Design a protein around this ligand. Sequence first.
Ligand SMILES: NC(=O)C1=CN([C@@H]2O[C@H](COP(=O)(O)OP(=O)(O)OC[C@H]3O[C@@H](n4cnc5c(N)ncnc54)[C@H](OP(=O)(O)O)[C@@H]3O)[C@@H](O)[C@H]2O)C=CC1
Ligand SMILES: NC(=O)C1=CN([C@@H]2O[C@H](COP(=O)(O)OP(=O)(O)OC[C@H]3O[C@@H](n4cnc5c(N)ncnc54)[C@H](OP(=O)(O)O)[C@@H]3O)[C@@H](O)[C@H]2O)C=CC1
Ligand SMILES: Cc1cc(Cc2ccccc2)n(O)c(=O)c1
Lengths: 358, 367
Amino acid sequence: KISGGSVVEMQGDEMTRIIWELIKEKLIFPYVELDLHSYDLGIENRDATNDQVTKDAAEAIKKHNVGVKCATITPDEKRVEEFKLKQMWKSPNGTIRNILGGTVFREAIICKNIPPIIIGHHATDFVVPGPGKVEITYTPSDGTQKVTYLVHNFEEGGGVAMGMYNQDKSIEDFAHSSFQMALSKGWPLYLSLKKYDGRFKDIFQEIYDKQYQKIWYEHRLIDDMEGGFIWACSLGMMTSVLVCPDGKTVEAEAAHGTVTRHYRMYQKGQETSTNPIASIFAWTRGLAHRAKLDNNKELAFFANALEEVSIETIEAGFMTKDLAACIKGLPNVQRSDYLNTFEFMDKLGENLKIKLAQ
Amino acid sequence: KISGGSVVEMQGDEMTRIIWELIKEKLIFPYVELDLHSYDLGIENRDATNDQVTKDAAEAIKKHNVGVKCATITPDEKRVEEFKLKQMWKSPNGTIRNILGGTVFREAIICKNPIIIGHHATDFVVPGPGKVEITYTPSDGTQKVTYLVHNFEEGGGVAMGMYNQDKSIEDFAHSSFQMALSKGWPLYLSTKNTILKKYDGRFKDIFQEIYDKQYKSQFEAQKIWYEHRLIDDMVGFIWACKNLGMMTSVLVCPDGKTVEAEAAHGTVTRHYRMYQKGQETSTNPIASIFAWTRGLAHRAKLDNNKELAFFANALEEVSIETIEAGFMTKDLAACIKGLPNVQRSDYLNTFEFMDKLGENLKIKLAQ
Ligand SMILES: NC(=O)C1=CN([C@@H]2O[C@H](COP(=O)(O)OP(=O)(O)OC[C@H]3O[C@@H](n4cnc5c(N)ncnc54)[C@H](OP(=O)(O)O)[C@@H]3O)[C@@H](O)[C@H]2O)C=CC1
Ligand SMILES: NC(=O)C1=CN([C@@H]2O[C@H](COP(=O)(O)OP(=O)(O)OC[C@H]3O[C@@H](n4cnc5c(N)ncnc54)[C@H](OP(=O)(O)O)[C@@H]3O)[C@@H](O)[C@H]2O)C=CC1
Ligand SMILES: Cc1cc(Cc2ccccc2)n(O)c(=O)c1
């Protein structure tokens, strides 16, 4: 077995929980020995501990640099009363991002036989009750100006208004996170309201021509946009990763939800077919990041190995039903066109056993 | 020949100009008689008249309530060079939009081989540290109100105001409620109401206030409903967002009487250079055709015109079912068979297609 080392992991809810556990027992643990800081973000436990788990889990990732996360129920009223929760807790993902900062990137994992671009997403509002001047003013600390622009003069009636700002530091991190990400995967980096959308283009350049292999960075406007590039701005084939400012701390995740609908059938004892891909990839993305930070060769090969098998397995035909519908189209899918959740998992572990054997 | 009545029409530019003329020659004029208020919004005539025609065309739609626009060139520094324009004129739609007001509505066109979507600035650079604020002095001498946007203590950055008048939202509301009745589809508004509690909280309210005092009766009188939702709970209906030869844009006014319709794409300059040069092309008319069929549809609703009303639907089918039957333009061919695998014998070119559409409208109509 391999020496994986420090890894913060968070168990989640419902159908993804069940899948998460399988991923571990059938793909991870049979191959890798990890220093595993486990946190249970399952809904009943978060409620029990007053979302405290979540806070510590977050401190843990800050502290160990690697985080993989299972999907977690976010509470609304139906849920507050379904689990008889003592509060409408906030989204765990909300909590974690706050504590960590940095920027999220989503990637569709591309299986050649189904019908890659990596996209990286990145105020005071009030009501005007009636006519009057609304003016957005700026006051240096050495008060040598007093730019104050008129936003609008209301005469019609009242209305609504707001003031959005953005700090340089925060723009820099974006570009940092962006450029770094763009190196790590060796893909062209692109980035897409005069002076605002503006100063962005600026700082990127200033940081490109100062800190950053046959690869380029550029600029565009939305519409102009083969594949295979980073870009600042099925579901079970989507993978979200939070890259922090420091470029050391990473937290990976499936970009879908807890798949309640599927889980509900599971509870009825009905066969399911849930796409483990997005979840598996979150693991590998973090495990390869574990590797990079440690210079662990064996593991670094393993994470890749696992990412490989998962495509090859779908490519050799064997796949889950959501994927079966992309090919066949929902209405005309035979059972014999896909595997259920457990059979799929069985097939991976099998192909993985074998791929790792050579 | 069905009499249609008062119709404002605006001829446009380049490729779309050509298609427009065919659309009238082969599919409209042979079946419908119209009191036509034409205006030529070609770049030439617009220039030669100091964009007066555009302004006239506007005031005329305001008047007769039904405008159908052919796509028109908006000039940029480059276009000006080419045409020797005496100014870089503002977009027609921009000027048209302002005179009539209202909200635009795009509609993708479904062939088995529907969702309508309606959408709706003071930036400046913070050099270094200091304070960014926004004020509201009320015009009635009451106490001036100050909000902190943010204190920049390290570097600078950037900041910006945004605003909106009540009146504008109300208009946004009406147009959408009118739009929902017109279509027989239920309506949804999407906001960032949790984040912009005070801002979007205003849209949501106004939609509700207007829904209940004005439209709740009529919606149920059609077995449909309006509802609010947040942007992620969102992802046969009308969707109000607070923010190709198969795409139809429609300006709807709040009075719900006036309406104006046009193809969403542009003037298709590429095909047109290819056309000037004399090579065959395969431009998609459908979107343009559809401007006519909403325009007519609307007039037919306004004027209690059962015979014209039927014509419109009749045509709308024909276009759909000509594609749905394997007869199509390259862009749609390519949609099915993949750009690299499209062959000549998979599509028909601009003229040939119009013919088929022509031939079929006859048949459909003879029944
Ligand atoms: N913490 C997190 O990571 C997130 C959690 N959530 C939470 O999840 C809960 C319920 O999830 P919900 O949004 O309803 O559904 P999901 O977001 O999990 O996905 C909805 C539908 O997409 C399809 N789908 C998604 N993922 C998969 C997969 N891995 N394999 C197969 N099919 C898939 C299924 O389609 P079909 O209906 O056809 O089966 C599913 O019902 C909510 O309480 C919400 O708070 C939501 C987003 C992110
Ligand atoms: N009046 C109006 O409402 C509008 C006017 N315009 C004006 O038009 C001018 C030029 O337009 P431009 O943006 O170059 O071109 P378009 O925006 O019309 O179209 C962009 C490209 O998409 C494809 N395409 C669009 N419509 C069709 C169709 N019906 N059938 C087949 N293919 C289509 C063509 O590319 P391909 O070669 O890939 O087939 C075309 O080159 C601009 O100066 C602009 O001001 C633009 C938008 C709206
Ligand atoms: C310049 C301009 C263009 C359009 C049409 C348009 C063209 C391309 C993308 C979107 C919309 N409209 O409507 C305007 O008001 C102004």
